[PDB]
């Protein structure tokens, strides 16, 4: 939920770990996404 | 999560430069120019005693 608000083109799903997906995202969006990587070790992009 | 701007808008400076120069000159050449080195007198002697 914290990740979802901080970005609200991405798609956020729960699965079993946090999963983030998207087709054509700007470098800023990717940099922002991996900036949130310091909030949970179990993250994949 | 904050990001910087692509660049910072600097201030623009106008420069006005002025270069001024004035030259004046005179040239004079007057009079009479005589010779200062001339030949002098000469003397010679010659004889056969024998």
């Amino acid at each position: 939920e914290e990740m979802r608000e901080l970005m609200g083109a991405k798609i956020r799903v729960v699965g079993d770990h946090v999963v983030v997906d998207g087709k054509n995202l700007a470098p800023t969006t990717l940099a922002r996404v991996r900036a949130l990587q310091a909030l949970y070790p179990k993250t994949i992009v | 999560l904050a990001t910087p701007s692509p660049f910072d808008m600097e201030k623009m400076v106008w420069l006005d430069v002025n270069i001024l120069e004035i030259r004046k000159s005179v040239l004079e050449n007057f009079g009479v120019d005589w010779s200062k080195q001339i030949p002098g007198p000469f003397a010679a002697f010659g004889k056969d005693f024998v």
Side-chain angles (χ1 to χ4, degrees), chain B:
Chain B
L1 302 191
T3 31
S5 311
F7 60 87
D8 296 288
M9 269 294 270
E10 304 286 13
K11 281 186 236 205
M12 295 284 309
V13 191
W14 187 274
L15 187 67
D16 191 6
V17 178
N18 280 271
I19 303 119
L20 306 94
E21 192 199 64
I22 302 173
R23 289 179 201 262
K24 290 185 192 115
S25 79
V26 214
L27 177 53
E28 281 155 16
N29 195 32
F30 61 102
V32 185
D33 188 26
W34 294 94
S35 292
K36 314 270 142 75
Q37 193 168 65
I38 64 171
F42 56 83
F45 180 78
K47 216 203 154 162
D48 287 324
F49 305 97
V50 198

Side-chain angles (χ1 to χ4, degrees), chain A:
Chain A
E1 202 31 273
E2 297 151 12
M3 294 224 155
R4 179 169 298 62
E5 294 155 25
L6 291 193
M7 320 279 318
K10 206 159 76 147
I11 284 317
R12 263 260 154 57
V13 207
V14 303
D16 163 27
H17 324 64
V18 59
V19 68
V20 284
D21 60 309
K23 288 214 46 43
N24 296 270
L25 308 192
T28 37
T29 314
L30 258 54
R32 192 180 166 117
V33 152
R34 64 193 56 290
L36 300 209
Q37 203 105 315
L39 173 151
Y40 201 144
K42 305 173 28 142
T43 53
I44 45 62
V45 278

